């Protein structure tokens, strides 16, 4: 399909494991907002877009009930064929050119995720980092797998080398993708 | 490693030349497999796999469902374009342009939006092409892109290299210089 722009106004995701669901809108491949199904709240990962319209979170809850219902039907019609675990692909790169003493952001891209269940954490000098970490939702792909991106704001220096740690059922053991200045 | 079963319902809006041309497609997906599709260019549900046949058959028989799907293009795609997408399409973030030697020169063009970008390398006002390699566009996930365009070179004293960048957020091209030191 040839178009100038593409929106997903309803990426609706629901899986048996949990069970668990996700509702997001995407425009030209970036996330506009998600719905926190727990809190019943529309949330914008980049609050700038909250100026571009509102969304009633109830619409997502409604689609999630349909999803639950349709998934059970489809499990039967597909002879209970379970999801094949894919091997995720991990890349770590920085947001801008890296200068020591100049605050930057590391970016961990976890691509080819299926099913959408993953643990992504950061390690500085082999130790788990907590602060300065954030994360996208599971973003959709035209082959119906997902990617997820995690961020680490960091001050580059000689003292710190970092890893991105990724856990997924398609991996035998945790995958560590290393990055250093 | 737990079993899992995944359901995805995607509502997609494709836009060309403003809203002169609008196409909507919905996809019902079991695990990675699209089983039934509505495509506004087609006008009815279409089974994509055998498991989608009774689904498409039923919905095509129900005028309420069929008319709901057919109305989607105006009630969802065009509606959302006026409420949100027209606004999002006005977003412009200028690229940062940075030259760094890796003999290879790396021109980093970072933090720009939208994705349309032109980058050229010059040596002494003569354009280089034979020794140039670029990455694909890189999605940061935070509504910015970056791209790297490398130049194979052999620096003589006196040579001037320039990275030349055009982008819709720029009235005139950014040029950055690198001199053999």
């Amino acid at each position, epitope marked *: 399909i040839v178009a100038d722009h593409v929106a997903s106004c309803g990426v609706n995701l629901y899986q048996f494991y949990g069970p668990s669901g996700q509702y997001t809108h995407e425009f030209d491949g970036d996330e506009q907002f998600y719905v926190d199904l727990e809190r019943k709240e529309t949330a914008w990962r980049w609050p700038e877009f909250s100026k571009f319209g509102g*969304f*009633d*979170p*109830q*619409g997502a*809850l*409604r689609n*999630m*009930a*349909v*999803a*639950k*219902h*349709n998934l*059970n039907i489809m499990i039967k019609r597909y002879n209970s064929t379970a999801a094949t675990n894919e091997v995720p692909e991990v890349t770590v790169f920085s947001k801008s050119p890296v200068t020591l003493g100049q605050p930057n952001t590391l970016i961990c891209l976890v691509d080819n995720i299926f099913p959408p269940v993953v643990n992504i954490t950061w390690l500085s000098n082999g130790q788990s980092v907590t602060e300065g970490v954030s994360e996208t939702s599971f973003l959709s792909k035209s082959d119906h797998s997902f990617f997820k991106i995690s961020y680490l704001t960091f001050l580059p220096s000689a003292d710190e080398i970092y890893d991105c740690k990724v856990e997924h059922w398609g991996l035998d053991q945790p995958l560590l993708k290393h990055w250093e200045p | 490693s737990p079993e899992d079963f995944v359901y995805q319902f995607k509502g997609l809006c494709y836009f060309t030349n403003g809203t002169e041309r609008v196409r909507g497609v919905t996809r019902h997906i079991y695990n990675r497999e699209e089983y039934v599709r509505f495509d506004s260019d087609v006008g009815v549900y279409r089974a994509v796999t055998p498991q989608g046949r009774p689904v498409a058959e039923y919905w095509n028989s*129900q005028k*309420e*469902v069929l008319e*709901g799907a057919r109305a989607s293009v105006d009630r969802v795609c065009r509606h959302n374009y006026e409420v949100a997408y027209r606004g999002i399409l006005q977003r412009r973030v200028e690229p940062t342009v940075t030259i760094s030697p890796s003999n290879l020169l790396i021109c980093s063009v970072t933090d720009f939006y939208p994705s349309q970008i032109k980058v050229r390398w010059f040596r002494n006002d003569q354009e280089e092409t034979a020794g140039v390699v670029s990455t694909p566009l890189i999605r940061n996930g935070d509504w910015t892109f970056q791209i790297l365009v490398m130049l194979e070179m052999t620096p003589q004293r006196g040579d001037v290299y320039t990275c030349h960048v055009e982008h819709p957020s720029l009235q005139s091209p950014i040029t950055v210089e690198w001199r053999a030191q």
Partner: T-cell receptor
Amino acid sequence: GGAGVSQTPSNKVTEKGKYVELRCDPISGHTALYWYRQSLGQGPEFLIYFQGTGAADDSGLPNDRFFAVRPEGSVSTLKIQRTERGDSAVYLCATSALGDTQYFGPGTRLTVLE
Amino acid sequence: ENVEQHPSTLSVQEGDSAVIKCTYSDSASNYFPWYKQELGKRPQLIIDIRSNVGEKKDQRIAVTLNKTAKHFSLHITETQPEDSAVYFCAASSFGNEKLTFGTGTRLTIIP
């Protein structure tokens, strides 16, 4: 289901502390099913909304003695545990082809006595 | 989010018009059905109107909608005795399909 929304019986009388089940039979093929509650001289108030077998919205359930099911995306049953006098009202079932346009059944009046 | 309905009771001579007015609180409301309820029975859907339309008529009954004022009304012309019932207005929105009802109007047609 049938051509209209059915609820039987029209009336149920019971005493405090007993268990009660109210049954709704939807219009054939209707994906959406709602329970509303109507007290004397008032309008219907929302209790719970099913899409197929799934609960879309249960925000109206008064407390945890109230629970409903729709195990096969057709017939729904509203269950009330340990009934109190304040639960007395007319319980109305409504179903919708897709969700928006709602057709009501004739209701079941629950009378909980001392 | 509530719907406000007036009057709570109304008597009108057979053959005269009957008018019921409602106001709603949520500007996102886009669907507005009206129900007629006979004693011992179910609210019966008699007419509805959507936010893209200001008026709709069906036989003896009419509904009007003013999105700006968030007012909507039901008119019953040349009332007949079988119009005696309790009438409810209601409202819902694109994202929230649950109906919220007014408090009702007991209409008595004097034969």
